[PDB]
C-alpha cells in the first residue's frame, strides 16, 4: 500500500468534492502519469487526458515536492457514487489506491 488516500469520501448531491492521494516523493514516481478512474476506466489524468463526462466539471494537480495530487470534483450526481481509484503509471500496474465515493441524496426543502 505504498500510495494512500480517502479509503470512502462521502459527499451530498450538488456539492464538489476534492480528493487527495499521496505518493513516495521520488523522481520516478514525480514524474509518471497520475490518474482518477472508475472501477478502471480512465476519467481524468495528469497527461492531458480528460473524459467526456469529466470535462470542465473536475480537475487533477500534481504537486511533486509533496508527493500528492489532487482530484477536484463538482456538481456531483447520483452517477458518481461508485468505485475508483487514483495511481500513478499505466491503470493495470496496480499501484493505486481504491476510493469509494458515495454521493448522499439531496432531500427536497420543506420546513
Ligand atoms: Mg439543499
Known sequence: ????????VNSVEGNSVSITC???PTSVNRHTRKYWCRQCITLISSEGY???????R???TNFPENGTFVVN???LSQDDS????????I???????????????HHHHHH
Open 1 to 8: 500500500s505504498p500510495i494512500f488516500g480517502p479509503e470512502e
Open 22 to 24: 499521496y505518493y513516495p
Open 50 to 56: 480528460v473524459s467526456s463526462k469529466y470535462a470542465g
Open 58 to 60: 473536475a480537475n487533477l
Open 73 to 75: 470534483i463538482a456538481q
Open 82 to 89: 461508485g468505485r475508483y481509484k487514483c495511481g500513478l503509471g
Open 91 to 105: 491503470n493495470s500496474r496496480g499501484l493505486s489506491f481504491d476510493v469509494s465515493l458515495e454521493v448522499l441524496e
